[PDB]
From Swiss-Prot, chain A:
Function: Adapter protein implicated in the regulation of a large spectrum of both general and specialized signaling pathways. Binds to a large number of partners, usually by recognition of a phosphoserine or phosphothreonine motif. Binding generally results in the modulation of the activity of the binding partner. Promotes cytosolic retention and inactivation of TFEB transcription factor by binding to phosphorylated TFEB. Induces ARHGEF7 activity on RAC1 as well as lamellipodia and membrane ruffle formation. In neurons, regulates spine maturation through the modulation of ARHGEF7 activity.
Species of origin: Homo sapiens (Human)
Residue positions, PTM N-acetylmethionine: M1
Keywords: Acetylation, Cytoplasm, Host-virus interaction, Phosphoprotein
Keyword DNA-binding assigned: no
Gene3D superfamilies the record matches: 14-3-3 domain
PROSITE patterns listed in its UniProt record: 1433_1, 1433_2
Record annotation: effect of changing K49E: Loss of interaction with NOXA1
Protein name as it appears in the record: 14-3-3 protein zeta/delta
Assembly and oligomerization: Interacts with CDK16 and BSPRY. Interacts with WEE1 (C-terminal). Interacts with SAMSN1. Interacts with MLF1 (phosphorylated form); the interaction retains it in the cytoplasm. Interacts with Thr-phosphorylated ITGB2. Interacts with BCL2L11. Homodimer. Heterodimerizes with YWHAE. Homo- and heterodimerization is inhibited by phosphorylation on Ser-58. Interacts with FOXO4, NOXA1, SSH1 and ARHGEF2. Interacts with Pseudomonas aeruginosa exoS (unphosphorylated form). Interacts with BAX; the interaction occurs in the cytoplasm. (Microbial infection) Interacts with Epstein-Barr virus protein BPLF1 and TRIM25; leading to inhibition of the type-I IFN response.
Amino acid sequence: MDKNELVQKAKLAEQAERYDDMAACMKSVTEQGAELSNEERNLLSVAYKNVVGARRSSWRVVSSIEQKTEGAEKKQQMAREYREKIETELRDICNDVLSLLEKFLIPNASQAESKVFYLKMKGDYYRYLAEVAAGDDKKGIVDQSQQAYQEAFEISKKEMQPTHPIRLGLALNFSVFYYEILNSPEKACSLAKTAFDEAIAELDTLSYKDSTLIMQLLRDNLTLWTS
Amino acid sequence: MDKNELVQKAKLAEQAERYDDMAACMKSVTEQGAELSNEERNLLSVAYKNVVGARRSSWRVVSSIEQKTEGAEKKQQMAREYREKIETELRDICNDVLSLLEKFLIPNASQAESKVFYLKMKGDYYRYLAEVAAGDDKKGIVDQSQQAYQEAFEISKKEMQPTHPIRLGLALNFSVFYYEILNSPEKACSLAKTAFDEAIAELDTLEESYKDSTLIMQLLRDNLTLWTS
Ligand SMILES: [Ca+2]
Ligand SMILES: [Ca+2]
Ligand SMILES: [Cl-]
Ligand SMILES: [Cl-]
Ligand SMILES: [Cl-]
Ligand SMILES: [Cl-]
């Protein structure tokens, strides 16, 4: 399977909702070492989002059951063991994505748009590791997530317009990092509100649907977190 | 791996929407050789329905895309080879289930209700093989589906009330077999209509678990509406 063929396969897999197949294809395209097109970048992101997402969803159910059963040490041990099984799958997915980002995607990123996208992505996957991390390793994983988001944030602020969907998307995920991982709701609200207001101010420079959708998500989090 | 632990793992897997895991647990439960409870056979059924379902849905997308490629032999060979990969996964799942049905489930079925349930299931999984079958094998696959359903149909008419959810569910799936596999719309409609009408008549003449029965009745009528253009 050569590049164009692997991309058409990934697109078939997407249509079939066979996301592990989709991820395998785009991993192989990425490993050929050439900078990904915008289309290929999105295919990779969609694939791994769904692959990791399935495990995250499962983890939340099994972790919720574990702690909603007071006593009954046979059933709690089972849920704990199944959570751990799911965690191993999730960690290996995140480490595969994070290895692709270090080796290929971030160093080859020749546009600010691309570099911000991949650094945001690095922040996300370290955040998914942080969701599942045990106390000892957690602080290091959380700092790795924060630094990836922060570098992405610096670059988008300098290079991209406030209405750009990748700049707005970064503000959404980084604000979520602050609220959910760092337990810093004031910082989360400040980041979200600033991104929203700066986008509102610069509505002259737009081209659209994605941008205003993310702005709505930002304000929804503000109202949720304010109450 | 004791029976009770495996059942609780299957329930965890179900909540996690990890249906391969769920099917593996219930496969192991079934292979211990003891007759399954109502709860256990439903867990087995739900697990495998979802496991095969994923591949069936994927097959319909990739098969459609293969037919939609008018003039592109490179993209069409790709779609065909991916369909074939999906088909082999699908057949292996169906044959797993059908093997559990022959070896353990149908032999140990001590009640008419469970006999009908497992024969319907046999009909379903041969029907899924029939959906994916090429001309050579298809006639034999289709006949095994029909014979499984037909035996289930006869036992259900003799032993169960018209409003029993298993009897109604059989009528639904058997009518779908006639419509989609044998292309016999008139037989599909008549089977589905008499099942609906006989259930409606039984509500007047005296039913316990309304919900499942009445839901299947709605699905029977929906098919009758769809199949009459
Ligand atoms: Ca998959
Ligand atoms: Ca699964
Ligand atoms: Cl897959
Ligand atoms: Cl998948
Ligand atoms: Cl699974
Ligand atoms: Cl699944």
